[PDB]
Amino acid sequence: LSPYLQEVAKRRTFAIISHPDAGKTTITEKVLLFGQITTSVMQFPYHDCLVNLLDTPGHEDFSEDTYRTLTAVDCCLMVIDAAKGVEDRTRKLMEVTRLRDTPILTFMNKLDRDIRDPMELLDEVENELKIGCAPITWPIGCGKLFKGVYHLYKDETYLYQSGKGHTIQEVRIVKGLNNPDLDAAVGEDLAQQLRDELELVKGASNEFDKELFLAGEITPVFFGTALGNFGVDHMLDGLVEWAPAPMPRQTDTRTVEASEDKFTGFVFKIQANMDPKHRDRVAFMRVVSGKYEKGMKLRQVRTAKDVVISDALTFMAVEEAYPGDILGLHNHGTIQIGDTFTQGEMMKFTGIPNFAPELFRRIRLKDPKQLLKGLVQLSEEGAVQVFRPISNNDLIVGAVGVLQFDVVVARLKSEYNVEAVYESVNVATARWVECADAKKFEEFKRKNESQLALDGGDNLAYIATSMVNLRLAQERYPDVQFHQTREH
Numbered sequence: 001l002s003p004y005l006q007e008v009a010k011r012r013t014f015a016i017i018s019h020p021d022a023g024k025t026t027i028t029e030k031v032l033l034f035g036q037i038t039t040s041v042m043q044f045p046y047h048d049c050l051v052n053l054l055d056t057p058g059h060e061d062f063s064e065d066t067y068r069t070l071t072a073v074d075c076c077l078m079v080i081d082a083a084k085g086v087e088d089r090t091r092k093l094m095e096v097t098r099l100r101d102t103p104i105l106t107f108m109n110k111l112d113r114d115i116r117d118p119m120e121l122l123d124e125v126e127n128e129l130k131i132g133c134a135p136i137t138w139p140i141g142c143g144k145l146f147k148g149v150y151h152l153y154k155d156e157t158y159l160y161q162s163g164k165g166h167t168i169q170e171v172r173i174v175k176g177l178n179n180p181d182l183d184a185a186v187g188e189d190l191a192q193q194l195r196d197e198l199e200l201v202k203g204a205s206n207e208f209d210k211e212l213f214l215a216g217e218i219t220p221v222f223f224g225t226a227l228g229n230f231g232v233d234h235m236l237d238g239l240v241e242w243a244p245a246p247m248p249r250q251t252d253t254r255t256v257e258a259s260e261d262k263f264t265g266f267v268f269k270i271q272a273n274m275d276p277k278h279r280d281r282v283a284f285m286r287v288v289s290g291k292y293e294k295g296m297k298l299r300q301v302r303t304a305k306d307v308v309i310s311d312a313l314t315f316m317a318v319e320e321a322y323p324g325d326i327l328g329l330h331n332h333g334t335i336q337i338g339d340t341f342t343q344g345e346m347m348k349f350t351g352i353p354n355f356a357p358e359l360f361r362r363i364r365l366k367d368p369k370q371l372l373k374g375l376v377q378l379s380e381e382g383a384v385q386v387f388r389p390i391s392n393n394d395l396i397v398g399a400v401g402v403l404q405f406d407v408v409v410a411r412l413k414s415e416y417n418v419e420a421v422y423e424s425v426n427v428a429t430a431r432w433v434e435c436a437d438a439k440k441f442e443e444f445k446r447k448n449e450s451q452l453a454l455d456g457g458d459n460l461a462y463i464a465t466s467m468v469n470l471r472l473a474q475e476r477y478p479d480v481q482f483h484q485t486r487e488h
């Protein structure tokens, strides 16, 4: 209990992972009224804690930076549409999460409307996402018949009042599971069905365990409706109680704890499109340790220069930050994704990655050609990834979300003189390739040369025609490693 450590102990940093249309926007909004650009990251008080919520843009905004945002959090909330179950992007974002086995909290949403069998929703999570479920609450009816939820550990029933949503409902609680007031509130039909279903839950599901939760191996499961603002506070109570305070982060040199003074942090995201009053392209940095104050002098390790940061975007609940918080650095071409910042100590954080792009095309000028110089530089920042096959001169751009393609053409025109045009190519993914046996490694290069390419950072990567072709290369050259991810 020493003022600075007090501020570290009470912070909780998380982001939502969800499929588009599942309810991130609705539940984020409701989360904020329980706490009483800025949308990027929002800090609010809840109970005795200070909670940092990072946006994970999933619509037209979707990009590789959405994935990288998850590297900068210590906890995620998986929001599932309880009518649709586990969807594609749900699976993709959990995938990203397994890089650090980040703890997950689950919120089954849209209980206003009819849903899939809740026991099946649990099943779906376990068999598809490889994580145990632990129901904390359990729904009592659904649709027009949604009456509320039951807490398995507090032995009580929260009662749902329809048509609230834009306020915080009155909390109404019946205490016994076997209290006849539960039957009077909900009907004996749904009260008996609760009791029978809890029996199946005990027989086929898992008790909550804080240890496994922190190891990324179970998740508490909450049921509610974000539109009607019910059960969101139930999930925030788990968040506060169970999610970690600012966790450590690994470096090339050592493990950095948040309990250290000395400011320390890394950049995980750079805003696409420069608007504000200039080209700020705000670089978002996660504070790993120490306190940022306004006039402070930091070390940009990449360039080995001292930078005074007088203006720094802050997302308060004035102009300070503690570990767990996010900072927006003003950037005019000097910051890059993965840039570490300290107060002199020269080391590099080692979590911030480059994911296998999910979308590809060939870039090309309608002539002639410093287009290469421009893609390599955009690649050094966050903008995109480029691939230069060994056997030819083509340039292949690799994005995660379509938006990135448009951004490259614009920035190529403005910051470099080039006018660039896209062309379809046959590429389904890439994998960075690696082999400690020089003899087997060169035999692999020789026999697969037509599918091999170089990064904008000179890392060798197999460019796969289809996933079937990737599985073939993998199984025929088992001594070679195919990585879906690499350090940026």
Ligand SMILES: Nc1nc2c(ncn2[C@@H]2O[C@H](COP(=O)(O)OP(=O)(O)O)[C@@H](O)[C@H]2O)c(=O)[nH]1
Pocket: 018, 019, 020, 021, 022, 023, 024, 025, 026, 027, 109, 110, 111, 112, 113, 224, 225, 226, 227, 228
């Ligand atoms: N009935 C019902 N509809 C919801 C609920 N939450 C969100 N919606 C609706 O589902 C749609 C998607 O919501 P949205 O928050 O934009 O999902 P997002 O894409 O993850 O941000 C919208 O038309 C919402 O009105 C829910 O609690 N119950």
